[PDB]
mmCIF file of C-alpha atoms and ligand atoms in Angstrom:
data_model
loop_
_atom_site.group_PDB
_atom_site.id
_atom_site.type_symbol
_atom_site.label_atom_id
_atom_site.label_comp_id
_atom_site.label_asym_id
_atom_site.label_seq_id
_atom_site.Cartn_x
_atom_site.Cartn_y
_atom_site.Cartn_z
ATOM 1 C CA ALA Q 1258 14.782 13.278 82.873
ATOM 2 C CA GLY Q 1259 17.077 12.784 79.870
ATOM 3 C CA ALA Q 1260 15.417 13.606 76.555
ATOM 4 C CA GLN Q 1261 11.960 14.253 78.045
ATOM 5 C CA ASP Q 1262 12.131 18.077 77.987
ATOM 6 C CA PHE Q 1263 13.079 17.897 74.280
ATOM 7 C CA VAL Q 1264 10.111 15.765 73.120
ATOM 8 C CA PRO Q 1265 7.225 17.902 71.784
ATOM 9 C CA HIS Q 1266 3.610 17.060 72.595
ATOM 10 C CA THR Q 1267 2.772 15.658 69.169
ATOM 11 C CA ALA Q 1268 2.378 12.392 67.304
ATOM 12 C CA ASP Q 1269 3.517 13.786 63.949
ATOM 13 C CA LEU Q 1270 6.631 11.799 63.056
ATOM 14 C CA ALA Q 1271 8.086 14.625 60.974
ATOM 15 C CA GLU Q 1272 7.681 17.005 63.914
ATOM 16 C CA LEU Q 1273 9.184 14.463 66.320
ATOM 17 C CA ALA Q 1274 12.155 13.800 64.035
ATOM 18 C CA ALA Q 1275 12.904 17.510 63.677
ATOM 19 C CA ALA Q 1276 12.771 17.946 67.446
ATOM 20 C CA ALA Q 1277 15.178 15.029 67.953
ATOM 21 C CA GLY Q 1278 17.740 16.962 65.912
ATOM 22 C CA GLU Q 1279 17.751 19.541 68.721
ATOM 23 C CA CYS Q 1280 17.874 17.016 71.561
ATOM 24 C CA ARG Q 1281 20.616 17.382 74.183
ATOM 25 C CA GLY Q 1282 19.240 14.670 76.485
ATOM 26 C CA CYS Q 1283 22.641 12.957 76.743
ATOM 27 C CA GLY Q 1284 26.106 13.699 75.414
ATOM 28 C CA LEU Q 1285 25.792 11.755 72.168
ATOM 29 C CA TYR Q 1286 24.472 14.669 70.082
ATOM 30 C CA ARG Q 1287 27.868 16.406 70.285
ATOM 31 C CA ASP Q 1288 29.996 14.202 68.027
ATOM 32 C CA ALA Q 1289 27.278 12.646 65.849
ATOM 33 C CA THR Q 1290 26.388 14.245 62.523
ATOM 34 C CA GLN Q 1291 22.641 14.312 63.152
ATOM 35 C CA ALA Q 1292 19.894 12.453 64.938
ATOM 36 C CA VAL Q 1293 18.598 9.411 63.074
ATOM 37 C CA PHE Q 1294 14.899 9.087 63.756
ATOM 38 C CA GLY Q 1295 12.720 6.165 62.802
ATOM 39 C CA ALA Q 1296 11.599 5.507 59.235
ATOM 40 C CA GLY Q 1297 8.132 4.425 58.143
ATOM 41 C CA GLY Q 1298 4.564 5.477 58.723
ATOM 42 C CA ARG Q 1299 2.060 5.610 61.557
ATOM 43 C CA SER Q 1300 -0.061 2.883 59.944
ATOM 44 C CA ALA Q 1301 2.670 0.314 60.650
ATOM 45 C CA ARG Q 1302 1.565 -2.726 62.618
ATOM 46 C CA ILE Q 1303 5.147 -3.904 63.242
ATOM 47 C CA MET Q 1304 7.816 -1.684 64.790
ATOM 48 C CA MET Q 1305 11.448 -2.794 64.837
ATOM 49 C CA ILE Q 1306 14.076 -1.309 67.141
ATOM 50 C CA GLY Q 1307 17.842 -1.635 66.872
ATOM 51 C CA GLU Q 1308 20.613 -0.258 69.044
ATOM 52 C CA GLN Q 1309 21.760 2.994 67.406
ATOM 53 C CA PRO Q 1310 22.539 4.415 63.970
ATOM 54 C CA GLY Q 1311 25.941 3.268 62.740
ATOM 55 C CA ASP Q 1312 28.486 4.980 60.493
ATOM 56 C CA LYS Q 1313 26.365 4.777 57.328
ATOM 57 C CA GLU Q 1314 23.121 5.712 59.110
ATOM 58 C CA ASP Q 1315 24.669 8.743 60.818
ATOM 59 C CA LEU Q 1316 25.392 10.252 57.390
ATOM 60 C CA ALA Q 1317 22.318 8.951 55.516
ATOM 61 C CA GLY Q 1318 19.881 10.131 58.169
ATOM 62 C CA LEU Q 1319 18.033 6.774 57.925
ATOM 63 C CA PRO Q 1320 18.182 3.564 59.973
ATOM 64 C CA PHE Q 1321 19.534 0.194 58.823
ATOM 65 C CA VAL Q 1322 21.163 1.279 55.544
ATOM 66 C CA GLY Q 1323 24.526 -0.456 55.934
ATOM 67 C CA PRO Q 1324 25.569 -4.112 55.850
ATOM 68 C CA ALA Q 1325 23.423 -5.030 58.870
ATOM 69 C CA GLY Q 1326 20.456 -3.421 57.128
ATOM 70 C CA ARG Q 1327 21.085 -5.403 53.954
ATOM 71 C CA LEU Q 1328 21.143 -8.650 55.935
ATOM 72 C CA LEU Q 1329 17.969 -7.573 57.731
ATOM 73 C CA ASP Q 1330 16.368 -6.918 54.317
ATOM 74 C CA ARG Q 1331 17.234 -10.461 53.218
ATOM 75 C CA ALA Q 1332 15.637 -11.830 56.400
ATOM 76 C CA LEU Q 1333 12.513 -9.672 56.013
ATOM 77 C CA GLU Q 1334 12.091 -10.830 52.425
ATOM 78 C CA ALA Q 1335 12.486 -14.475 53.475
ATOM 79 C CA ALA Q 1336 9.866 -13.823 56.180
ATOM 80 C CA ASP Q 1337 7.487 -12.276 53.579
ATOM 81 C CA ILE Q 1338 7.548 -8.909 55.370
ATOM 82 C CA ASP Q 1339 7.607 -5.675 53.361
ATOM 83 C CA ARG Q 1340 10.104 -3.276 54.930
ATOM 84 C CA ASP Q 1341 8.061 -0.338 53.595
ATOM 85 C CA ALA Q 1342 5.187 -1.413 55.871
ATOM 86 C CA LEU Q 1343 7.325 -1.329 59.057
ATOM 87 C CA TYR Q 1344 8.338 1.453 61.400
ATOM 88 C CA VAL Q 1345 12.084 0.994 61.936
ATOM 89 C CA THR Q 1346 14.023 2.865 64.623
ATOM 90 C CA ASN Q 1347 16.733 2.527 67.283
ATOM 91 C CA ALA Q 1348 16.951 2.713 71.061
ATOM 92 C CA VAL Q 1349 19.419 5.623 70.854
ATOM 93 C CA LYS Q 1350 19.192 8.286 68.136
ATOM 94 C CA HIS Q 1351 22.778 9.572 67.905
ATOM 95 C CA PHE Q 1352 25.747 7.443 66.789
ATOM 96 C CA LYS Q 1353 28.269 6.736 69.572
ATOM 97 C CA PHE Q 1354 31.619 6.006 68.000
ATOM 98 C CA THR Q 1355 35.368 6.143 67.750
ATOM 99 C CA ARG Q 1356 37.970 5.634 65.034
ATOM 100 C CA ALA Q 1357 40.919 3.249 65.048
ATOM 101 C CA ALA Q 1358 44.191 3.989 63.297
ATOM 102 C CA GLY Q 1359 44.215 2.629 59.759
ATOM 103 C CA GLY Q 1360 40.546 1.721 60.135
ATOM 104 C CA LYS Q 1361 37.968 1.486 57.371
ATOM 105 C CA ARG Q 1362 35.006 2.983 59.245
ATOM 106 C CA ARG Q 1363 33.850 4.735 62.370
ATOM 107 C CA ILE Q 1364 33.241 1.969 64.905
ATOM 108 C CA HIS Q 1365 30.146 1.968 67.060
ATOM 109 C CA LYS Q 1366 30.449 1.894 70.840
ATOM 110 C CA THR Q 1367 27.832 0.453 73.131
ATOM 111 C CA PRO Q 1368 25.413 2.977 74.678
ATOM 112 C CA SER Q 1369 25.451 2.995 78.443
ATOM 113 C CA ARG Q 1370 22.240 2.074 80.228
ATOM 114 C CA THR Q 1371 22.179 5.768 81.226
ATOM 115 C CA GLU Q 1372 22.132 6.844 77.559
ATOM 116 C CA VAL Q 1373 19.431 4.285 76.719
ATOM 117 C CA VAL Q 1374 17.207 5.527 79.536
ATOM 118 C CA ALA Q 1375 17.945 9.143 78.557
ATOM 119 C CA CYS Q 1376 16.833 8.535 74.950
ATOM 120 C CA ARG Q 1377 13.876 6.274 75.726
ATOM 121 C CA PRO Q 1378 11.343 9.168 75.744
ATOM 122 C CA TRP Q 1379 11.794 9.294 71.955
ATOM 123 C CA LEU Q 1380 10.952 5.585 71.708
ATOM 124 C CA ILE Q 1381 7.895 6.173 73.886
ATOM 125 C CA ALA Q 1382 6.832 9.044 71.602
ATOM 126 C CA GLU Q 1383 7.335 6.824 68.530
ATOM 127 C CA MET Q 1384 5.300 4.001 70.036
ATOM 128 C CA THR Q 1385 2.568 6.478 71.038
ATOM 129 C CA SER Q 1386 2.544 7.819 67.479
ATOM 130 C CA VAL Q 1387 2.573 4.471 65.666
ATOM 131 C CA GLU Q 1388 0.586 2.277 68.108
ATOM 132 C CA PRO Q 1389 2.268 -0.931 66.880
ATOM 133 C CA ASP Q 1390 0.708 -4.336 67.452
ATOM 134 C CA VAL Q 1391 4.159 -5.907 67.832
ATOM 135 C CA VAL Q 1392 7.651 -4.599 68.541
ATOM 136 C CA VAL Q 1393 10.684 -6.544 67.330
ATOM 137 C CA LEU Q 1394 13.687 -5.807 69.549
ATOM 138 C CA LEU Q 1395 16.882 -6.368 67.550
ATOM 139 C CA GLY Q 1396 19.756 -7.131 69.921
ATOM 140 C CA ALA Q 1397 20.619 -6.714 73.587
ATOM 141 C CA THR Q 1398 20.436 -2.912 73.939
ATOM 142 C CA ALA Q 1399 16.996 -2.580 72.332
ATOM 143 C CA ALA Q 1400 15.598 -5.595 74.172
ATOM 144 C CA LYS Q 1401 16.874 -4.315 77.515
ATOM 145 C CA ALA Q 1402 15.408 -0.869 76.787
ATOM 146 C CA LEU Q 1403 11.895 -2.313 77.141
ATOM 147 C CA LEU Q 1404 12.456 -5.553 79.110
ATOM 148 C CA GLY Q 1405 14.980 -4.452 81.761
ATOM 149 C CA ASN Q 1406 18.764 -4.193 81.994
ATOM 150 C CA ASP Q 1407 19.073 -7.826 83.143
ATOM 151 C CA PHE Q 1408 17.188 -9.238 80.149
ATOM 152 C CA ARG Q 1409 19.048 -11.866 78.085
ATOM 153 C CA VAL Q 1410 17.985 -12.053 74.412
ATOM 154 C CA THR Q 1411 19.815 -15.370 74.139
ATOM 155 C CA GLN Q 1412 17.479 -16.947 76.727
ATOM 156 C CA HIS Q 1413 14.115 -15.960 75.218
ATOM 157 C CA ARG Q 1414 14.349 -16.705 71.488
ATOM 158 C CA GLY Q 1415 11.044 -17.371 69.767
ATOM 159 C CA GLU Q 1416 8.955 -16.049 72.667
ATOM 160 C CA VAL Q 1417 6.102 -13.551 72.564
ATOM 161 C CA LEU Q 1418 6.659 -11.292 75.553
ATOM 162 C CA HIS Q 1419 4.532 -8.575 77.064
ATOM 163 C CA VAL Q 1420 5.033 -5.976 79.792
ATOM 164 C CA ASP Q 1421 2.688 -3.212 80.939
ATOM 165 C CA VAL Q 1422 5.030 0.091 76.869
ATOM 166 C CA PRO Q 1423 2.227 2.239 75.366
ATOM 167 C CA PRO Q 1424 2.122 -4.470 71.935
ATOM 168 C CA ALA Q 1425 3.528 -7.955 71.863
ATOM 169 C CA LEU Q 1426 7.331 -7.927 72.114
ATOM 170 C CA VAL Q 1427 9.699 -10.271 70.286
ATOM 171 C CA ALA Q 1428 13.393 -10.056 71.148
ATOM 172 C CA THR Q 1429 15.841 -11.420 68.608
ATOM 173 C CA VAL Q 1430 19.444 -11.382 67.470
ATOM 174 C CA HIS Q 1431 20.786 -8.153 66.041
ATOM 175 C CA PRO Q 1432 21.496 -8.483 62.286
ATOM 176 C CA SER Q 1433 25.054 -7.199 62.767
ATOM 177 C CA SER Q 1434 25.777 -10.344 64.812
ATOM 178 C CA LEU Q 1435 24.981 -12.459 61.735
ATOM 179 C CA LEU Q 1436 27.558 -10.787 59.474
ATOM 180 C CA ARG Q 1437 30.633 -12.561 60.889
ATOM 181 C CA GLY Q 1438 31.579 -16.025 62.052
ATOM 182 C CA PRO Q 1439 31.683 -19.599 60.767
ATOM 183 C CA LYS Q 1440 29.271 -20.053 57.904
ATOM 184 C CA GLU Q 1441 27.158 -22.857 59.412
ATOM 185 C CA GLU Q 1442 26.642 -20.796 62.560
ATOM 186 C CA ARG Q 1443 25.705 -17.707 60.525
ATOM 187 C CA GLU Q 1444 23.222 -19.771 58.517
ATOM 188 C CA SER Q 1445 21.592 -21.287 61.578
ATOM 189 C CA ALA Q 1446 21.404 -17.825 63.150
ATOM 190 C CA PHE Q 1447 19.850 -16.363 59.992
ATOM 191 C CA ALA Q 1448 17.138 -19.050 60.021
ATOM 192 C CA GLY Q 1449 16.374 -18.181 63.648
ATOM 193 C CA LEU Q 1450 16.033 -14.492 62.783
ATOM 194 C CA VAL Q 1451 13.557 -15.382 60.022
ATOM 195 C CA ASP Q 1452 11.635 -17.527 62.533
ATOM 196 C CA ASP Q 1453 11.443 -14.683 65.039
ATOM 197 C CA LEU Q 1454 10.292 -12.205 62.370
ATOM 198 C CA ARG Q 1455 7.587 -14.701 61.408
ATOM 199 C CA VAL Q 1456 6.502 -14.970 65.067
ATOM 200 C CA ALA Q 1457 6.145 -11.182 65.133
ATOM 201 C CA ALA Q 1458 4.253 -11.069 61.833
ATOM 202 C CA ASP Q 1459 1.831 -13.743 63.091
ATOM 203 C CA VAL Q 1460 0.786 -11.726 66.167
ATOM 204 C CA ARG Q 1461 -2.980 -11.115 65.964
HETATM 205 O O1 URA P 2579 20.007 1.602 62.214
HETATM 206 C C1 URA P 2579 20.831 0.852 62.597
HETATM 207 C C2 URA P 2579 22.025 0.418 61.820
HETATM 208 C C3 URA P 2579 22.975 -0.501 62.371
HETATM 209 N N1 URA P 2579 22.792 -1.053 63.695
HETATM 210 C C4 URA P 2579 21.606 -0.632 64.463
HETATM 211 O O2 URA P 2579 21.357 -1.013 65.555
HETATM 212 N N2 URA P 2579 20.643 0.294 63.895
HETATM 213 S S1 SF4 P 2580 21.135 9.917 71.908
HETATM 214 FE FE1 SF4 P 2580 18.902 10.376 72.325
HETATM 215 S S2 SF4 P 2580 18.867 11.380 74.393
HETATM 216 FE FE2 SF4 P 2580 21.034 11.425 73.656
HETATM 217 S S3 SF4 P 2580 21.197 13.510 72.674
HETATM 218 FE FE3 SF4 P 2580 20.673 11.970 71.072
HETATM 219 S S4 SF4 P 2580 18.383 12.021 70.826
HETATM 220 FE FE4 SF4 P 2580 18.959 13.005 72.794
#
């Protein structure tokens, strides 16, 4: 059942976010600082879902505030999308992490499929609350959360997908993947992210 017993019967995002702070649906609440719920309002037509809060998000209490978020902001601006009009969240609400010796940050670790399924009732509550017209799935974990554990983001770029989810679905690269690598490859990947955001914004 995972998080289900912890989700209150409400669509108020402030009430949902407070309840997520008390969630024990998987083990991730133990070491994380706090739950990081989605940000934005229930009028949003576009919802965007990443993997999990990272190091910066875990302490800010807000999603996509670190380097990946700054790259995402650049892509949203190039796509003529106002971040303030979106509802932005993550498939898992507590940061899963470790530290390396001499390291500069806490390093995120990939949620297991078990943790994703455990936390998914929060995503369902968010989608019920917001009623988005389109959901942008940023990266493998988020895409698989709605499209199945076998789903390959790399094989469905640019496609409007739909499964029977309380919207059109658009699965794209995670912004963190665009931070590193040879410059020409990063630039081609950035253009593809802008394209996918534009596909989402053009739905209906
Ligand atoms: O909110 C965030 C920040 C970094 N990476 C994610 O998937 N989500
Ligand atoms: S990651 Fe999700 S299911 Fe796990 S304890 Fe946190 S809010 Fe609950």
